[PDB]
Structures are given as structure tokens and as C-alpha cells.
Design a binder for these strands. Structure first.
Ligand SMILES: [Zn+2]
Ligand SMILES: [Zn+2]
Length: 52
DNA sequence: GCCAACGGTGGC
DNA sequence: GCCACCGTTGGC
């Protein structure tokens, strides 16, 4: 839907730890106010372009 | 019951 | 129209 499942980003298992989206995650100390996938995991086909 | 992460939105 | 945010919920 937002995932082609076939691109580099869909195949990643590891959050980068460093992008705006990662720094938001509780697992990285963030306040969980934004709540999107790591930038490197945003499907290059299907994702909002501004998430890429 | 928690959580990843989506879709909708209010304010700009 | 954008985007920061947050309500929602499938999957666990
Ligand atoms: Zn990241
Ligand atoms: Zn993809």
C-alpha cells in the first residue's frame, strides 16, 4: 500500500538511528510525536514523497 | 494491551 | 499544498 516490498528501502530491517524520523522514536530517545518509519525505509515507489 | 506506522488534519 | 502532529488499529 505504502510498500512495494521490492525496493532497497522495503528490504531494510535496520533503522538508521540518525534521521528526523528515527530521532523521534522512543527507541532513540525521541518523544514519539512524528511517528513515521526511518527515512531509509520509506518505499521509493509508494511513499509520500516528502518522507523519502 | 503494546507498538509500528498509517491516514487525516489544523495551522500556516 | 505542506508538514508537524496525533488518532487509529492490525498484528503481535
Ligand atoms: Zn532513520
Ligand atoms: Zn518499496
Amino acid at each position: 500500500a505504502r510498500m512495494c516490498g521490492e525496493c532497497e528501502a522495503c528490504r531494510r530491517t535496520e533503522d538508521c538511528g540518525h534521521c528526523d524520523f528515527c530521532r523521534d522514536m522512543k527507541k532513540f530517545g525521541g518523544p514519539n510525536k512524528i511517528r513515521q518509519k526511518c527515512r531509509l525505509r520509506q518505499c521509493q515507489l509508494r511513499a509520500r514523497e516528502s518522507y523519502k
